[PDB]
Design a protein around this ligand. Structure first.
Ligand SMILES: CCCCCCCCCCCCCCCCCC(=O)OC[C@H](COP(=O)([O-])OCC[N+](C)(C)C)OC(=O)CCCCCCCCCCCCCCCCC
Ligand SMILES: CCCCCCCCCCCCCCCCCC(=O)OC[C@H](COP(=O)([O-])OCC[N+](C)(C)C)OC(=O)CCCCCCCCCCCCCCCCC
Ligand SMILES: CCCCCCCCCCCCCCCCCC(=O)OC[C@H](COP(=O)(O)OCCN)OC(=O)CCCCCCCCCCCCCCCCC
Ligand SMILES: CCCCCCCCCCCCCCCCCC(=O)OC[C@H](COP(=O)(O)OCCN)OC(=O)CCCCCCCCCCCCCCCCC
Ligand SMILES: CCCCCCCCCCCCCCCCCC(=O)OC[C@H](COP(=O)(O)OCCN)OC(=O)CCCCCCCCCCCCCCCCC
Ligand SMILES: CCCCCCCCCCCCCCCCCC(=O)OC[C@H](COP(=O)(O)OCCN)OC(=O)CCCCCCCCCCCCCCCCC
Ligand SMILES: CCCCCCCCCCCCCCCCCC(=O)OC[C@H](COP(=O)(O)OCCN)OC(=O)CCCCCCCCCCCCCCCCC
Ligand SMILES: Nc1ncnc2c1ncn2[C@@H]1O[C@H](COP(=O)(O)O)[C@@H](O)[C@H]1O
Lengths: 54, 459, 347, 320, 140, 101, 49, 55, 98
């Protein structure tokens, strides 16, 4: 009898990165909330030098 | 027309500076006073129309629509003050301001002597209606009803503007008083074919036309009572007024061009009446009846004879009043039983006698019982379409039977038979509801005494 | 970022755009474009996150390619004319190269690929600064070389930009991508009417700048980036929902709002030159922009989306942001129709 | 506002008003570790302003008239309801945890604003760097679900990265049996329902996850129960610390100015607490939120801004 | 592409079916080449063979649509002795739509393509008859 | 498990329970009575009775009476002098030029 | 005293109020003077005195 | 049959599904700079030779 | 025109089609940008010295200055990239696709 207002089902449609998903848009995660990504620190590869006997 | 625009605009400081619970009383009182002062537009002459200034003029065609709009606003405020009793005060003031703004745009639409100004107000009526439907409705599907109502109308009206601008580059002016003397015949060509389509399809969409009517059963049954009133009784007549204004420039190409739309409406009246014979919803039944009556008005305008024009405007006024009454009846039943099913609440004559009398009277005026103006308009359209061709009367006559096959049916399932056993919240009829139905019906019954004021600009 | 350095950089951006606007030499035009790009790069690098680095790299590559094409066309015009006056060109190849370079600088399709990604990867301040201020100098350069652009090329670019922006705006939930696709569609709308009467182009530019600034400033005030927070805004301040509702109704080209100001009169300039198919197609395509504007209004204002418990605390703290010129800008973007002949001052 | 970029340009630097005594101290411990008065002792020996532990009604005391709001307007959670039945079906536990964490974020923002604006150190109790430990106990006892942990981790990740750790953290080591004895001597009937396993898990996540990860970015001072009863040793140990670790060392005036710009905007601080992620514990429906908001608006002193309320006695409104 | 349209349009309608069909085939092949070039640009195929297969498929589909449209339009114009009539172009557009449905191996696509391309071809013939302009030279 | 913490749906309100003399306008009896009086006075005693009186006494609408009376003169002209009642040509044939054919 | 903390707008900013009133008065008198000289010079040019 | 399916199919649902399909096709790019600049080169190649925009 | 003009324009087009098709390396695109700048410089000074426009000899050198005003800038837009990822590949710059 009350006026209908949207629930989590109507509000969760817009929560994705895209509105109509496709096969290509399958791994598209949404952007972060603060748009700051983890640094994904790779191996820095310090060069190994042989200050040898000669 | 500045003596009617200014009080309508001043209604908003009335509804925003009012007390905590005195908004409805003040708005109803002052809108009824505006409706009383609206009768000064009856200064019509047998040859000359009433011209106020370079922007506003009132013929004998726009005057009944103006009077109907300014009469409908207090009835609208009376109708929409029961399901908004739990609403916020700011939201209530916003709703009243929306109704006032919509009425202002409506009374500025009909008096426009320029077709561009008329078109601008004709699209400016879209925004408050869409806002009302999508905000103060009850179901979910109103959101869908906010799309089909919108993107239909603009899809008809965005080409038409271009055609209107073309006239501004061709005839030198778009003033209706000038164009009555500077009009030119339209030769048969593909360019004039598509210009006719551009100038007409907006008014076929907003009337509506069968095939393009799909937005009307959706925007009538999710909308609130005030929205249902504004769609049924006024907003479907913008297409008819635009047709009557724009048919002057589209001659003589209309003689062979109007055939497919005439056939579409002549079959759509039968199709929509048959749909009304099997509808499970009261509101959808009233919507499809509105579609059928406006298809009849489309036929009347397209055959363009004086009797057809007279029947068209009489049918417009009568259908507006009758559809408003039927929608208020449906709203009262919906407020009492909290559902829209026709078969749910039966045998209401044993519980509400006066509402049964109002239902019987509204169904009587729906099937055009003489000498009501419904019968006057429908009869004159029938005479004109018999003059047009001798076979179309069959396509009229059968339709009449189907009308009497659903309206009384809409009576019986809601009024007669054994009452349902598990419904025991049937309250007695309020004074406000009975006042609403009497204010809807008594002008309609009184107009049968003097119908010469609603017989168009060529009476 | 130091406030002194930020003020100096913003003044450099303004000086570069002014140098493009007021100079009568092609080399000075290119110098102003280079200064504008160099001083607009670090604005997008304000927060030092990776997405800013991708956006800056893509923007820099596109702008460098556009500047190279612009200088090549300038050199070809010098070869074929022997002067430097900023006026009509004397080689169709130079005109084509300048039109391509200015289309890449304006982000017009099919050079529109960088616009939504750059707009999404940068903050709202840099996004507003880009999408409003950086679209002033190339429009002025297009205004100056009016008797030189090929009609077919610029009209094809305009209709392509309008169609591509209208199609791309439907499938987005981020607000910045929606604004970028809207900017592309409006770019096509301005360049559609440029060759007929550029006064309508200037009117459309002013109106589009006002509406885009209003929407971006409302996004600042509500601190929203996605559609869900914009929906959640109804719990904090409903006046903001009213303002974004009337603004998004304005940008849809719905009368009697000021967004009906350019487009209608744009049609008024295409029928005088016997072009009736193109304005009809352009309005039919702008219906898509109206569609996703209506979707945004349904999500934000006309429906009451669910909220969270923590918003209760936000009821105890009023907004203390510097909403500069927001009511004036909303009033200009909504109720400017009855002052329609004011555009006669733009001649 | 009062402090802006024009003020920083005109000469109002941040490091000029920051002396050596400006230190941020977070005193920590168990439920009844006795730190609640001990920190106050460190308030009255070093001359530092004391902030009590941020409860449900911290924001109610911060703004308005200072009186606590009703629970239906602020918090929508009860600590006693959690203490009676921690496995309640309405999700009271995670709602209380989220409200407490957001209140602690507000308290940390207020303390950082006071420290950066006045140069006087602030003494806190159980700041945002040591709240998740409580959450871990709620996960180890099965009081909440994994989605609550994921949402809390998302909120913490998007919020805590814009702030700074405290200079000194003090941990009061009290065993579980002594904590239970102090709780039984407290006399609060709702606190007697705390299980021994909950306090044991709190101690385990304090000693295993908080302190090993916290001692790199600041300096720890672990104290026993007997040593926390004498504040002279605590203040003497605080006054002779060689601050060399932590991100406070490499701070210019620009970084502190940006931190003060972000901190002094309270809605910017609480922007990411209410992320639109739909969880049964925290999601409030449309009609309930509408009713609560409309009832909150009509409260005295809350309808308009903090100086435009005629029902409380604010004058010269028409000239403001 | 200016010379291809001029080559197709200067041939009288319903006179030489083969040259008109060849011109329409060339127009369709050019449009399909543009479409396939953009497709292999933006969406990279996994191999060279897949890319050339997609290019050949798009070009053959568009060429078949254009060839059947031109042949059907010329056949209708010869059969009806109505060269300046858009209904022949409507028939050719529907034939091209049926060809598109056959190439896509579906019926609803064929029906929709028939309807929309028949309307588009009728509009193109209408504009050629009435002298409509799509890219209007500015005059005022 | 309790998705969507929500207030329960309130029951229907009967205006006759707290006030059996309710006209259906407002739950406050004085406001309801005054609204009823305003509606029944300005809806029936002002815009219907006086409105119908104004419409009934319209001063010669569309000169529909006058066109009769002038006709009552005009026939009495042309019947008196033997003229035909109506000519087949609306305009005088002497003042209109036809194209050559 | 009601609020537990001093609001930033508890007392009216008198210098801002004075600046606003002075700016409004100066703009009004400047517009009136400009209109008077404009209509006077228009009457002088066309001789419509 | 007619007013609930077919009239609801020919006009509104066809354009609705076409706009959905075109919106999915347009915005399905991978976000790579190399493909975008290759499309730029192909656009320049089309404009120079096939469309004769340099005349 | 002449012959060296044709060769310099051919060099510009060669460097343009070198730039527009990337090969998964940002430095190569920067080298292509420098090459197009050099070709434009050479064409401009060839035309200027042929036509004896002496007062425009300020043009090319000043033009050359603004080369660094992007080119060195490009290097400053690389080091953060090379701090975000271990290499400078252009396929790693695809985070802005959603
Ligand atoms: C609601 C759904 C249905 C909507 C139907 C709306 C109407 C259908 C027809 C509209 C045609 C477009 C407007 C035409 C205005 C013509 C004015 C004029 O002066 O014409 C003479 C002019 C004549 O050209 P001219 O005036 O420039 O030349 C001088 C005159 N001659 C030719 C003698 C030299 O006609 C035209 O310019 C062409 C008119 C046809 C245009 C065809 C393209 C549009 C096709 C229809 C698209 C409709 C929308 C579809 C999508 C809807 C949303 C989903
Ligand atoms: C117009 C468009 C908007 C529509 C909505 C309007 C809303 C606002 C409404 C305002 C008020 C109403 C305006 C219209 C008024 C129409 C009435 C009117 O004035 O008519 C003028 C007509 C005028 O008649 P007339 O034109 O013949 O007279 C010449 C004119 N005068 C009066 C100046 C001499 O009034 C009448 O006909 C009244 C006649 C006397 C009263 C009735 C007597 C008979 C009653 C019934 C007897 C029993 C019959 C059998 C019953 C069996 C059981 C059912
Ligand atoms: C024919 C050619 C016509 C040319 C006309 C030229 C007119 C003048 C130039 C207009 C162009 C835009 C100028 C402003 C660009 C954007 C400035 C900007 O983004 O400033 C940032 C600032 C941030 O404020 P804050 O919220 O404190 O900071 C958040 C943390 N970053 O502030 C904001 O984000 C808030 C917004 C501040 C500026 C709003 C007002 C100016 C822009 C809109 C135009 C208003 C109407 C006046 C001009 C009409 C014609 C365009
Ligand atoms: C149901 C959905 C909702 C409603 C939508 C609208 C429905 C009504 C409008 C469409 C009705 C069917 C089409 C119109 C039929 C009547 C007019 C017509 O086109 O007749 C066929 C015509 C006859 O030839 P004739 O009229 O002499 O042509 C020269 C004059 N220009 O034949 C010809 O000229 C030959 C064929 C010409 C091309 C026809 C097809 C394209 C143009 C129409 C679209
Ligand atoms: C012919 C035919 O076989 O149509 C069927 C086809 C679907 O084919 P399939 O389902 O594979 O068998 O169905 C289709 O191709 C789709 C429908 C074809 C066109 C129907 C046109 C009239 C539709 C009703 C209009 C009412 C107004
Ligand atoms: C819905 C969409 C409706 C579109 C309606 C388009 C109507 C046709 C407009 C173009 C056209 O055919 O114009 C006629 C013109 C022939 O006349 P003319 O200008 O003398 O050509 C000689 C060249 N100077 O023809 C020409 O100039 C050459 C042919 C142009 C064809 C343009 C459309 C091609 C097909 C779609 C892409
Ligand atoms: C006679 C007029 C015929 C055309 C009328 C206008 C199109 C049909 C009516 C509007 C759209 C109706 C609708 O609701 O479509 C739903 C569909 C998917 O939308 P979705 O977001 O999934 O649904 C939200 C849940 N209610 O939405 C869509 O697929 C979006 C389609 C938008 C089309 C807008 C009109 C474009 C016209 C120009 C095309 C070029
Ligand atoms: N995040 C939290 N979750 C549950 N209870 C808490 C939390 N933070 C503090 N408390 C309670 O606060 C009280 C400790 O305050 P105090 O006695 O002053 O040290 C104990 O009852 C704790 O259970």
């Amino acid at each position: 009898a009350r006026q209908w207002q949207p629930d989590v089902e109507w509000a969760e449609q817009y929560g994705g990165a895209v509105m109509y998903p496709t096969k290509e848009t399958a791994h598209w995660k949404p952007p972060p909330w603060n748009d700051v990504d983890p640094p994904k620190d790779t191996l820095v590869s310090n060069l190994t030098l042989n200050f040898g006997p000669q | 027309m500045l003596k009617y625009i200014i009080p309508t605009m001043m209604l908003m400081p009335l509804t925003w500076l009012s007390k905590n619970s005195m908004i409805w009383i003040n708005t109803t009182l002052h809108s009824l006073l505006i409706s009383l002062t609206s009768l000064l537009l009856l200064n019509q002459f047998g040859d000359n129309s009433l011209n106020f200034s370079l922007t506003f003029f009132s013929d004998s065609l726009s005057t009944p629509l103006l009077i109907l709009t300014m009469w409908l606003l207090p009835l609208m405020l009376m109708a929409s003050q029961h399901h908004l009793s739990k609403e916020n005060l700011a939201r209530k003031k916003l709703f009243i301001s929306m109704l006032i703004l919509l009425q202002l745009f409506l009374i500025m639409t009909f008096t426009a002597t320029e077709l561009i100004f008329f078109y601008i107000m004709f699209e400016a009526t879209l925004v408050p209606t869409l806002i009302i439907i999508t905000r103060w409705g009850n179901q979910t599907e109103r959101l869908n009803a906010g799309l089909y109502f919108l993107f239909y109308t603009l899809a008809g009206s965005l080409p038409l503007l271009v055609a209107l601008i073309y006239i501004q580059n061709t005839m030198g002016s778009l003033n209706f008083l000038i164009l009555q003397y500077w009009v030119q015949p339209m030769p048969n060509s593909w360019s004039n074919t598509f210009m006719w389509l551009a100038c007409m399809m907006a008014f076929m969409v907003k009337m509506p036309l069968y095939g393009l009517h799909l937005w009307l059963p959706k925007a009538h049954v999710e909308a609130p009572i005030a929205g249902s009133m504004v769609l049924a009784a006024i907003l479907l007549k913008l297409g008819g007024y635009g047709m009557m204004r724009i048919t002057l420039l589209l001659n003589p190409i209309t003689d062979f061009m109007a055939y497919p739309f005439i056939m579409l409406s002549l079959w759509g009246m039968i199709m929509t009446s048959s749909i009304c014979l099997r509808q499970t919803d009261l509101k959808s039944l009233i919507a499809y009846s509105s579609v059928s009556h406006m298809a009849l008005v489309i036929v009347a305008i397209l055959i363009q004879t004086p009797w057809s024009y007279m029947g068209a405007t009489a049918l417009m006024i009568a259908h507006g009043l009758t559809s408003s009454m039927l929608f208020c009846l449906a709203n009262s039943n919906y407020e009492r039983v909290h559902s829209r099913t026709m078969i749910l609440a039966r045998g209401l004559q044993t519980l509400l006698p006066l509402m049964a009398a109002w239902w019987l009277l509204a169904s009587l005026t729906n099937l055009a019982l003489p000498p009501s103006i419904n019968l006057i308009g429908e009869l004159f359209v029938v005479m004109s379409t018999f003059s047009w061709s001798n076979i179309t009367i069959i396509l009229m006559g059968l339709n009449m039977v189907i009308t009497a096959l659903y309206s009384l049916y809409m009576l019986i399932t809601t009024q007669r038979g054994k009452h349902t056993h598990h419904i025991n919240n049937i309250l007695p009829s309020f004074t406000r509801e009975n006042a609403l139905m009497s204010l809807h019906m008594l002008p309609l019954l009184l107009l049968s005494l003097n119908p010469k004021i609603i017989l168009g600009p060529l009476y | 970022m130091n406030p002194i350095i930020l003020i100096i950089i913003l003044m450099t951006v303004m000086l570069g755009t002014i140098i493009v606007m007021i100079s009568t030499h092609w080399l000075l035009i290119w110098i102003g474009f280079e200064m504008n790009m160099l001083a607009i790069i670090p604005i997008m690098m304000k927060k030092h996150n990776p997405r800013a680095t991708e956006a800056s790299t893509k923007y820099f590559l596109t702008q460098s390619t556009a500047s190279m094409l612009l200088m090549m066309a300038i050199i070809i015009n010098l070869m074929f004319s022997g002067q430097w006056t900023v006026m009509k060109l004397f080689n169709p190849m130079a005109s084509m190269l300048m039109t391509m370079a200015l289309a890449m600088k304006l982000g017009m399709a099919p050079f529109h690929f960088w616009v939504p990604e750059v707009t999404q990867g940068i903050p709202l301040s840099s996004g507003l600064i880009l999408l409003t201020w950086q679209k002033l100098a190339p429009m002025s350069v297009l205004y100056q070389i009016l008797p030189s652009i090929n009609l077919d090329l610029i009209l094809t670019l305009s209709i392509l930009s309008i169609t591509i922006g209208g199609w791309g705006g439907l499938n987005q939930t981020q607000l910045r991508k929606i604004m970028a696709y809207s900017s592309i569609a409006h770019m096509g709308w301005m360049t559609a009417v440029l060759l007929y009467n550029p006064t309508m182009t200037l009117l459309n530019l002013i109106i589009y700048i006002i509406m885009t600034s209003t929407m971006f400033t409302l996004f600042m005030a509500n601190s929203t980036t996605t559609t869900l927070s914009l929906s959640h805004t109804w719990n904090k301040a409903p006046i903001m929902t009213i303002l974004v509702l009337i603004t998004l109704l304005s940008m849809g080209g719905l009368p009697p709002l000021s967004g009906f100001m350019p487009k209608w009169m744009i049609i008024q300039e295409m029928t005088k030159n016997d072009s009736i198919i193109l304005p009809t197609l352009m309005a039919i395509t702008a219906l898509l922009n109206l569609y996703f504007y209506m979707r945004l209004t349904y999500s934000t204002a006309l429906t009451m989306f669910p909220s969270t418990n923590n918003m209760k605390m936000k009821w105890q703290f009023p907004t203390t942001k510097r909403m500069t010129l927001l009511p004036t800008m909303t009033v200009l973007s909504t109720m400017l129709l009855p002052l329609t002949p004011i555009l006669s001052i733009l001649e | 506002l009062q402090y802006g970029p024009l003020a920083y340009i005109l000469g109002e630097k941040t490091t000029k008003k920051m002396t050596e005594n400006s230190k941020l101290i977070t005193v920590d411990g168990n439920i009844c570790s006795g730190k609640s008065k001990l920190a106050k002792e460190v308030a009255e020996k070093l001359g530092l302003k004391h902030f009590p532990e941020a409860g449900i009604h911290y924001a109610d005391s911060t703004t308005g008239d200072g009186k606590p709001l009703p629970v239906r307007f602020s918090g929508n959670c009860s600590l006693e309801k959690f203490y009676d039945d921690p496995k309640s079906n309405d999700g009271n536990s995670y709602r209380l945890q989220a409200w407490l964490y957001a209140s602690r974020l507000l308290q940390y923002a207020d303390a950082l604003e006071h420290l950066l604006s006045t140069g006087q150190g602030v003494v806190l109790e159980r700041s945002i760097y040591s709240d998740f430990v409580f959450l871990e106990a709620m996960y180890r006892q099965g009081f909440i679900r994994k989605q609550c942990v994921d949402h809390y981790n998302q909120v913490k990740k998007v919020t805590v990265c814009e702030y700074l750790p405290p200079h000194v953290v003090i941990y009061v080591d009290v065993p579980v049996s002594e904590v239970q004895s102090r709780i039984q001597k407290k006399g609060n009937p709702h606190e007697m329902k705390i299980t021994s396993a909950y306090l044991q898990d709190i101690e385990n996540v304090y000693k295993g996850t908080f302190l090993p990860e916290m001692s790199e970015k600041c300096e720890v001072l672990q104290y026993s129960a007997w040593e926390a009863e004498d504040a002279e040793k605590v203040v003497e140990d605080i006054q002779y610390l060689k601050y060399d670790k932590g991100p406070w060392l490499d701070q210019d005036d620009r970084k502190l100015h940006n931190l003060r710009m972000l901190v002094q905007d309270k809605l910017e601080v609480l922007n990411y607490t209410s992320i639109p992620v739909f969880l049964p514990e925290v999601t409030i429906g449309a009609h309930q939120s509408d009713r609560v908001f409309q009832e909150f608006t009509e409260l005295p002193g809350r309808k308009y801004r903090a100086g435009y309320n005629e029902d409380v006695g604010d004058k010269w409104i028409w000239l403001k | 592409a200016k010379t291809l349209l001029h080559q197709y349009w200067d041939i009288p309608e319903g006179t030489e079916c083969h040259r008109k069909t060849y011109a329409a085939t060339s127009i369709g092949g050019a449009s399909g080449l543009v479409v396939s070039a953009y497709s292999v640009a933006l969406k990279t195929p996994t191999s060279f063979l897949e890319g050339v297969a997609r290019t050949g498929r798009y070009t053959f589909t568009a060429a078949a649509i254009g060839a059947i449209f031109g042949l059907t339009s010329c056949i209708s114009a010869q059969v009806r002795e109505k060269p300046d009539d858009p209904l022949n172009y409507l028939i050719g557009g529907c034939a091209g739509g049926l060809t598109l449905g056959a190439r896509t191996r579906s019926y609803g696509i064929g029906a929709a393509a028939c309807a929309y391309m028949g309307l588009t071809a009728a509009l193109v013939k209408m504009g050629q008859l009435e002298g409509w302009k799509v890219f209007a030279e500015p005059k005022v | 498990t309790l998705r969507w913490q929500e207030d329960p749906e309130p029951e229907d309100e009967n205006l006759y329970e707290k006030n059996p003399d309710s006209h259906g306008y407002d739950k406050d009896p004085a406001v309801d009575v005054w609204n009823m009086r305003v509606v029944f006075f300005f809806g029936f005693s002002i815009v219907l009775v006086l409105g119908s009186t104004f419409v009934a006494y319209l001063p010669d609408y569309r000169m529909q009476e006058w066109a009769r009376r002038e006709a009552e003169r005009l026939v009495k002209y042309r019947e008196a002098h033997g003229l035909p009642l109506m000519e087949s040509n609306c305009f005088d044939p002497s003042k209109i030029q036809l194209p050559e054919d | 005293k009601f609020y537990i903390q001093e609001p930033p707008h508890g007392s009216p900013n008198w210098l801002k109020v004075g600046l606003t009133l002075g700016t409004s008065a100066f703009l009004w008198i400047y517009l009136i003077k400009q209109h008077n000289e404009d209509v006077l010079e228009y009457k002088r040019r066309n001789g419509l005195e | 049959l007619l007013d609930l399916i077919w009239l609801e199919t020919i006009l509104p649902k066809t354009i609705s599904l076409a706009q959905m399909k075109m919106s999915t096709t347009i915005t399905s790019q991978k976000g790579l700079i190399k493909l975008y600049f290759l499309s730029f080169l192909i656009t320049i190649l089309i404009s120079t030779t096939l469309l004769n925009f340099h005349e | 025109m002449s012959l060296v003009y044709m060769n310099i324009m051919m060099a510009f087009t060669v460097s343009l089609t070198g730039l527009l098709m990337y090969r998964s390396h940002l430095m190569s695109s920067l080298l292509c940008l420098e090459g197009m700048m050099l070709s434009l410089f050479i064409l401009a000074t060839l035309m200027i010295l042929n036509s004896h426009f002496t007062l425009a000899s300020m043009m090319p050198i000043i033009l050359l200055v603004f080369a660094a005003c992007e080119a060195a800038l490009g290097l400053s837009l690389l080091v953060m990239v090379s701090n975000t990822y271990g290499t400078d590949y252009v396929q790693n710059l695809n985070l802005l696709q959603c």
